[PDB]
Design a binder for this molecule. Structure first.
Ligand SMILES: CC(=O)N[C@@H]1[C@@H](O)[C@@H](O)[C@@H](CO)O[C@H]1O
Ligand SMILES: *[C@@H]1O[C@H](CO)[C@@H](O)[C@H](O)[C@H]1NC(C)=O
Ligand SMILES: *[C@@H]1O[C@H](CO)[C@@H](O)[C@H](O)[C@H]1NC(C)=O
Ligand SMILES: *[C@@H]1O[C@H](CO)[C@@H](O)[C@H](O)[C@H]1NC(C)=O
Ligand SMILES: *[C@@H]1O[C@H](CO)[C@@H](O)[C@H](O)[C@H]1NC(C)=O
Ligand SMILES: *[C@@H]1O[C@H](CO)[C@H](O)[C@H](O)[C@H]1NC(C)=O
Ligand SMILES: *[C@@H]1O[C@H](CO)[C@H](O)[C@H](O)[C@H]1NC(C)=O
Ligand SMILES: *[C@@H]1O[C@H](CO)[C@H](O)[C@H](O)[C@H]1NC(C)=O
Ligand SMILES: *[C@@H]1O[C@H](CO)[C@H](O)[C@H](O)[C@H]1NC(C)=O
Ligand SMILES: *[C@@H]1O[C@H](CO)[C@H](O)[C@H](O)[C@H]1NC(C)=O
Ligand SMILES: [Ca+2]
Ligand SMILES: [Ca+2]
Ligand SMILES: [Ca+2]
Ligand SMILES: [Ca+2]
Ligand SMILES: [Ca+2]
Ligand SMILES: [Ca+2]
Ligand SMILES: [Ca+2]
Ligand SMILES: [Ca+2]
Ligand SMILES: [Ca+2]
Lengths: 106, 83, 115, 416, 166
């Protein structure tokens, strides 16, 4: 297990010599080749490997709008979860997420 | 009675703005939320012209053409097409 | 204010038959009717005048007659939480406490002061 | 070495060839002559699984200002400070105890060990000298008076209360609940009134702070990853700019032109400007399970109120004195007591609030005000950290646990 | 003998006072004794929860401690009644400490600094000026000692299994 992990476990670095990283599909690899990190850390807002490649190639919010799995507030132009729309509680500034178009739960 | 779209009520109506817009305290007017300022592009005989909606700025996109009768644009590739 | 009867759940009050009257202050007080009935959270005096309720039983004469300070009121009135109370059954604002002025019937407002 | 407090050797060439330097003991600081000592006014406090410790605000210096607090086991979460006695209050979940300690390490005392389940915030009111804490297991807010160690529970039936801050001058208390629908609530100091001042666009309001240069309230939200600040009525509201890597903030404090913040996902302390955000500085990184950040300031705790006036102390209240808005005071009584026509004074209420036993049936009462299962009474270890349970055990009056082992000649019991 | 199921971790002496000092991380305590085995005392118990190594300064009568619960290098009096913290910045796993009061140098080792590098480091006895003495071919440096007539530093490494001198 020590033969190639990332740490020089002996003086001359006989281990880790000539390796190619081959981490499983549950993980992500970074652009300069130095590190592999689990998938949850890709696109999470934190630079988890040098050269920021884990966050560089990430989806972005369209200008002034929200993702398809989000809802937008009329009065403030702000995005909230899709579930929050019409759940009895006013989440928006003007409470527009609780509009008259919705139907009850029995 | 409303900017953009509105929905009927059994004795009244309510006003709503489309995505990308904000609704002002008027309850009936909409404003746009993108940081991008709009602009106007129109085509003369020999030219394509660039104009600001406030009329403050005038500019040229292209010149020396023959007779430019029609324009359109593509957002995806940031392209301009003309006849 | 004028006439009392022992009704169910407690006392009842009636005004004299001699004129046109109106009932106020939980109907425990009698007033002479000319309209001009007052707003919520106020207190009224039998001369037909209205004041902020805090002045009630404050040991100061708020009205042309001492209706605000009568024992018929101050035997049952209770002092608000943010006030100070004296053995007289009277309420004074707390900042008067140890102000070198009496402001109560007794010396209690200035009693026990550490000066 | 002419030094006031401590003299430490340096290289023989250092200090113009004198070869020594001067240092000041904990709670102290060095003055312009670099020989004399002055008592610390400003330092930052933070809590973590392993330790509660304080550091200076000048990032050029990175040595602790106070003796760190640490024990085995430890999980510190909630902290506050008292400046007039150079003391800090801290809560430990691995022991479910609230302690007061001095920044020189010389003193340690227990405020309470009774009926604490998931205490994860402490607030201190210094004019009346009251201590407030939030508990997410009992779903309640509790207040204690330290002179008499008198206890009352003032808010109950909250969903998921996290953070509490108290404002003695304004007579207001602020609280946060993150169970959806999340809310930020305002109350009076006695808890007599309660209203949600913010309930729109809040996901996980983990932390609250008060700004005293402006009399404003700040909160940080971990669902939307934002910092917002408002006025104490909630009617004026503003949002700071995007912090660079803030993705799960938990703790917030405000000092001068800066706002200090803690992030779980980074395990880090971050500093940005309270007007705009931006100018991200990272004060520490790699902190294991960082929880709270608090700012020690002796000048902040200056003040007076009707509860503190020398010519009529404690507002003439017998047990509790509470400041309430518009510069006036209210009185309160502990659990087993009621208020009297002269609200200054208290009486006993066996009708509505009878006395209660310490620990119920299936537990052993420990002398410090703590409850532990009966099986633990003589298992061989100090399950009560006063060593109450292992006291006078193995004697004829108290035989030992089946889990333990007993020493035949000695009649003393050790873990198996 | 370690009372109450303790152990002895790090040891250092003062000659002109006939004293031997040692650390116990199971008891979270520091003890002093006379080399004849008499006159035994406890001098620190408030926040030394995981000590490893001690150094002693015989010119100014100071004792230097390495602590790992909160990574610290601390300075005290031989009685324990004055205290300072000298080095806190980048210590991740401080393990070894050595002193030279004649010149005024402090040497210490860390087998995993927060910056990631293992380090052997030099400082002034007040902590003022700091220098990296060894970074190449370095694993888990666990102990430092000094030769004072030749002014040499010796350290031991347990990952790369060597004993080496600079
Ligand atoms: C019958 C009725 O209520 N009509 C109202 C109308 O008066 C106006 O208020 C409008 C505003 O959108 O709503 C509808
Ligand atoms: C990587 O793993 C796959 C799957 O086991 C294998 O086929 C491939 O040869 C590996 N490549 C290297 C360079 O190890
Ligand atoms: C011009 O804009 C197009 C838009 O698609 C882009 O692909 C191209 O790289 C741009 N060229 C320069 C020189 O900016
Ligand atoms: C939300 O806050 C507003 C503040 O005015 C209040 O009127 C409203 O009742 C609150 N909603 C709930 C569900 O508590
Ligand atoms: C710490 O040492 C002092 C001085 O000997 C002693 O009084 C105190 O009881 C000790 N504390 C503990 C917890 O052992
Ligand atoms: C994010 O994606 C949008 C398209 O949805 C645009 O391409 C935009 O330029 C992208 N980048 C940013 C920073 O918003
Ligand atoms: C109650 O909910 C059920 C869900 O299937 C139906 O929508 C039903 O119509 C509801 N009841 C009423 C009275 O509308
Ligand atoms: C008087 O006291 C009673 C309690 O005994 C009530 O609190 C009532 O509201 C009080 N009234 C006033 C005016 O203070
Ligand atoms: C009794 O129980 C009540 C309700 O839980 C309070 O916690 C009170 O503090 C308990 N007992 C004592 C001695 O105060
Ligand atoms: C001694 O008492 C302990 C409680 O501390 C246990 O109940 C144990 O079972 C007892 N054993 C005997 C022999 O009495
Ligand atoms: Ca290896
Ligand atoms: Ca990432
Ligand atoms: Ca909603
Ligand atoms: Ca209609
Ligand atoms: Ca009056
Ligand atoms: Ca007076
Ligand atoms: Ca988040
Ligand atoms: Ca036990
Ligand atoms: Ca146990």
């Amino acid at each position: 297990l020590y033969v190639c992990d990332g740490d020089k476990d002996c003086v001359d670095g006989s281990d880790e010599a000539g390796c190619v990283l081959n981490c499983t599909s549950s993980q992500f690899k970074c652009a300069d080749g130095s590190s592999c990190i689990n998938s949850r850390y890709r696109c999470d807002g934190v630079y988890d490997c040098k050269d920021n490649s884990d966050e560089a190639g990430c989806p972005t919010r369209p200008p002034g709008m929200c993702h398809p799995d989000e809802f937008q507030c009329q009065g403030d132009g702000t995005c909230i979860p899709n579930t929050w729309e019409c759940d009895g509680h006013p989440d928006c500034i003007q409470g527009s997420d609780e509009h008259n178009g919705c139907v009850p739960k029995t | 009675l409303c900017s953009q779209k509105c929905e009927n009520v059994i004795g009244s109506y309510i006003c709503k703005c489309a995505p990308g817009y904000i609704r002002e305290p008027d309850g009936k007017s909409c404003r746009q939320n993108s940081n991008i300022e709009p602009y106007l592009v129109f085509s003369n005989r020999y030219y394509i012209r660039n104009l600001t909606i406030d009329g403050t700025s005038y500019s040229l996109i292209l010149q020396g053409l023959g007779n430019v009768v029609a324009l359109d644009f593509d957002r995806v590739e940031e392209r301009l097409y003309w006849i | 204010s004028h006439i009392c009867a022992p009704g169910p759940n407690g006392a009842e009050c009636q005004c004299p038959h001699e004129g046109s009257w109106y009932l106020a202050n939980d109907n425990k007080y009698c007033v002479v009717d000319t309209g001009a009935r007052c707003n919520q959270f106020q207190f009224t005096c039998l001369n037909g005048r209205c004041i902020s309720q805090d002045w009630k039983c404050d040991n100061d004469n708020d009205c042309g007659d001492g209706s605000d300070e009568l024992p018929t009121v101050c035997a049952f009135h209770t002092c608000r939480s943010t006030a100070f109370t004296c053995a007289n059954g009277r309420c004074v604002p707390y900042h008067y406490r140890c102000d070198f002025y009496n402001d109560c019937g007794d010396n209690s407002d200035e009693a026990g002061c550490l000066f | 070495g002419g030094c006031a407090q401590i003299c430490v050797l340096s290289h023989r060439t250092d200090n113009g060839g004198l070869g020594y330097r001067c240092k000041c003991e904990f709670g102290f600081e060095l003055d312009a002559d670099e020989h004399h000592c002055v008592a610390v006014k400003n330092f930052l406090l933070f809590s973590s699984q392993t330790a509660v410790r304080g550091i200076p605000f000048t990032l050029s210096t990175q040595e602790d200002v106070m003796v760190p607090v640490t024990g085995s086991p430890s999980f510190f979460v909630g902290i506050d400070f008292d400046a007039q006695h150079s003391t800090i209050f801290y809560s430990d979940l691995s022991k479910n105890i609230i302690y007061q300690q001095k920044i020189d390490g010389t003193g340690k005392e227990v405020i309470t060990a009774n009926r604490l389940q998931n205490v994860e915030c402490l607030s201190f009111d210094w004019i009346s000298r009251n201590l407030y804490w939030t508990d997410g297991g009992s779903k309640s807010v509790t207040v204690m008076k330290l002179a008499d160690k008198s206890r009352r529970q003032i808010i109950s039936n909250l969903n998921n209360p996290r953070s509490i801050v108290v404002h003695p001058a304004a007579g207001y208390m602020f609280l946060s609940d993150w169970f959806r629908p999340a809310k930020i609530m305002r109350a009076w100091s006695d808890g007599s009134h309660l209203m949600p001042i913010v309930n729109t666009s809040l996901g996980w309001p983990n932390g609250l702070a008060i700004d005293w240069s402006t009399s404003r309230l700040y909160w940080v939200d971990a669902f939307f990853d934002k910092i917002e600040h408002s006025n104490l009525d909630g009617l004026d509201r503003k949002r700071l700019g995007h912090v660079d890597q803030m993705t799960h903030p938990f703790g917030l404090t405000v000092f001068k032109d800066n706002v200090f913040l803690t992030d779980w996902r980074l395990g880090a302390i971050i500093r940005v400007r309270k007007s705009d955000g931006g100018d991200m500085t990272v004060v520490r990184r790699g902190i294991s399970s960082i929880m709270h950040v608090k700012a020690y300031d002796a000048d902040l705790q200056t003040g007076t109120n009707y509860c503190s006036q020398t010519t009529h102390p404690n507002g003439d209240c017998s047990h509790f004195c509470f400041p309430v808005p518009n510069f006036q005071r209210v009185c309160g009584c502990p659990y087993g007591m009621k208020l009297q026509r002269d609200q200054m004074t208290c009486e006993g209420d066996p009708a509505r609030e009878p006395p209660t036993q310490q620990c119920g049936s299936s537990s052993f009462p420990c002398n410090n005000g703590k409850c532990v299962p009966s099986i633990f009474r003589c298992d061989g270890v100090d399950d009560c950290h006063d060593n109450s349970d292992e006291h006078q055990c193995g004697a004829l009056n108290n035989t030992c646990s089946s889990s333990a082992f007993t020493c035949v000649h000695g009649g003393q019991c050790i873990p198996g | 003998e370690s009372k109450n199921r303790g152990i002895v971790m790090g040891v250092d002496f003062h000659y002109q006072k006939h004293r031997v000092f040692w650390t116990d991380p199971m008891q979270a305590k520091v003890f002093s004794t006379d080399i004849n085995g008499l006159n035994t005392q406890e001098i620190l118990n408030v926040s030394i929860d995981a000590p490893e190594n001690l150094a002693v300064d015989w010119i100014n009568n100071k004792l230097y401690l390495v602590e790992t619960r909160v990574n610290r290098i601390d300075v005290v009096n031989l009685e324990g009644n004055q205290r300072v913290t000298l080095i806190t910045e980048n210590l991740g796993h401080p393990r070894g400490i050595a002193l030279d009061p004649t010149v005024g140098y402090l040497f210490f080792s860390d087998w995993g600094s927060l910056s990631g590098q293992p380090k052997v480091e030099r400082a002034f006895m007040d902590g003022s000026n700091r220098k990296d003495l060894v970074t190449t071919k370095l694993g888990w440096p666990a102990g430092i000692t000094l030769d004072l007539v030749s002014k040499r530093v010796y350290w031991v490494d347990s990952r790369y299994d060597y004993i080496e001198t600079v």
